[PDB]
Amino acid sequence: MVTAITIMALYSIVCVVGLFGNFLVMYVIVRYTKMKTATNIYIFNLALADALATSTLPFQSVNYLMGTWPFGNILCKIVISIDYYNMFTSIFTLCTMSVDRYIAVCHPVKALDFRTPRNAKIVNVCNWILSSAIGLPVMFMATTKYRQGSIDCTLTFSHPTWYWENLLKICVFIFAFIMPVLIITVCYGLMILRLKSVRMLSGSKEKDRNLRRITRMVLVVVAVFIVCWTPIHIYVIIKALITIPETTFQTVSWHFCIALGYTNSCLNPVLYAFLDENFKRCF
């Protein structure tokens, strides 16, 4: 009994705070910044991706609480599609913002040519379309199976099932963990290496404090992403390789990893909007 209420509470608070943060970011962007800058456009895209991804938490919580899916096939397919689509959208938006900052800092001459609101809109549309290449296949492949006392959401398994599962899981792991981690790591490392040489940062005590604050922000963002997304990918990889008995510890670890993966979406607004200096100037 304690495990079920623990998991339900975890999902409930995570979902509530995630939607509140994302919608406050929406209101601030649409009222104050008007998406007149590339970074504001990227932040709005990130907020949209995170919001929809968080919105898929009540369905999972109800599915676990009841042990069955009462929403039916129509809601099941759209929820699976929203989950995969917006997870990939949020990850790609984080990658896009990291590359944007790297270009802004390490390539100042070309940043005048490229960092424009029109290019930001183009890149947002490109990311949203590219996420469809996975959101739509899982929209079609989503299926609802029935057992003696349960209704479960899953995917249809094209033959060979083993090959299909390996392909899908490996693709999700690579395009959702390895590539974003490498991109953000390289971009932010080069960005810090370049920022160490700026006269406005490598100066007096206040300039040193500003440089240290910048480095701390970069490191905390990268660490938050890695810590929030590594456990679920690793534990899913382990589950696909060895059999794990169904115990209380197993279920709690599984659901804690899932809630941590969503907590990334919840924390992204704080790291990128609330702690952003421009938004703070909106009195």
């Binding site: 898929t56 599915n63 699976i80 989950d83 997870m87 899953t154 599984w254 993966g261």
Partner: peptide, 5 residues
Amino acid sequence: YXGFX
């Protein structure tokens, strides 16, 4: 993400 399944 690991949800459903």
